């Protein structure tokens, strides 16, 4: 193991393309840009979504819906996250302390995702009917 004996992994350091360096390179004299036109020019090319003048897709379709400001303060909690909490009893504060939900989360819902093994006391959280059964099946307790 010397400084002049270390070698990178096979196929991890592919060489980059070098355009316009002769015929043998396969990329000479045009750099793979074709012959003429807008796309062959330096800085050439059309912007995103441009379709040649036809009404682009994101303009011929209607806008729909609105953004809910309550969805930004609502999170979902998996069953597998109930064991990461400290103390057993879970609420908004204990989930935030465990870095499970964001600091600005005001509403939290436990869903049937993952699996819970220890008795957990859920307090002040909405629980799906599937997760409610799984929590009670592990000796847990749900209180509003």
């Amino acid at each position: 193991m010397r400084l002049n004996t270390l070698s990178p992994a096979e196929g991890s350091k592919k060489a980059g393309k070098r355009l316009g360096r002769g015929i043998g390179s396969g990329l000479g004299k045009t750099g793979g840009r074709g012959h003429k036109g807008q796309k062959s020019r330096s800085g050439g090319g059309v912007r995103r979504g441009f379709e040649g003048g036809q009404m682009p897709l994101y303009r011929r379709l209607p806008k729909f819906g609105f953004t809910s400001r309550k969805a930004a303060i609502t999170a979902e909690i998996r069953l597998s996250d109930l064991a990461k909490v400290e103390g057993g009893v879970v609420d908004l504060n204990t989930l935030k302390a465990a870095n499970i939900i964001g600091i600005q989360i005001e509403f939290a819902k436990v869903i049937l995702a993952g699996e819970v093994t220890t008795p957990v006391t859920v307090r002040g959280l909405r629980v799906t009917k599937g997760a409610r059964a799984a929590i009670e099946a592990a000796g847990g307790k749900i209180e509003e």
Partner: protein, 201 residues
């Protein structure tokens, strides 16, 4: 696993995951390369056609003169013109995952004990900060090119090694991947190896 000391002739137990794992050359190579990149200063620059001192005046009119059309005396085609893609001061430092860095040290340390390039002693010190003493001590151990790693950095040992070219001392926390590879032998005190294990989990 046991690391036999050179003088006390007693074994020293160490974690097998730290000193007895396989050598991941691809992993070590990336960390060694990234360490060299971190040493780069990257202080350089050239002048584009915008920074070259000169006038924006058109050297001659567009048509009629019979010469190739020109627009600026600073053009990169011209002598004394700018550089087409003039360099800027850049930062060559790469990111190394914490686990990839620590994973490379374990692969290097485990490789050293496999090459018998790692020597473990109970203690290593000199009385006065005199390079003559340290040079004599290493000759007794048949060592010329060696990296010495101690638990606490002693000033006398540090001063005595400053002028020795093929020798350098290092704290237990100051080890780096390229130093462990660059030197022929690596001498670690029993205190240093203990501190290295805590560093590498």
């Amino acid at each position: 696993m046991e690391l036999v000391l050179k003088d006390a002739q007693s074994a020293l137990t160490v974690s097998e995951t730290t000193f007895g794992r396989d050598f991941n050359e691809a992993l070590v190579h990336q960390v060694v390369v990234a360490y060299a990149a971190g040493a780069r200063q990257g202080t350089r620059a050239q002048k584009t056609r915008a920074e070259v001192t000169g006038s924006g005046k058109k050297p001659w009119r567009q048509k009629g003169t019979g010469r190739a059309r020109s627009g600026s005396i600073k053009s990169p085609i011209w002598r004394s013109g700018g550089v087409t893609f003039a360099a800027r001061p850049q930062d060559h430092s790469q990111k190394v995952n914490k686990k990839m860095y620590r994973g490379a040290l374990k692969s290097i340390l485990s490789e050293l004990v496999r090459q018998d390039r790692l020597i473990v002693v109970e203690k290593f010190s000199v009385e006065a900060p005199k390079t003559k003493l340290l040079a004599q001590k290493l000759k007794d151990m048949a060592l010329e090119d060696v990296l010495i790693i101690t638990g606490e950095l002693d000033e006398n040992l540090f001063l005595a090694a400053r002028n020795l070219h093929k020798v350098d001392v290092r704290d237990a926390t100051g080890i780096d991947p390229v130093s462990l590879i660059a030197f022929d032998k690596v001498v670690m005190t029993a205190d240093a190896v203990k501190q290295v294990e805590e560093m590498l989990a």
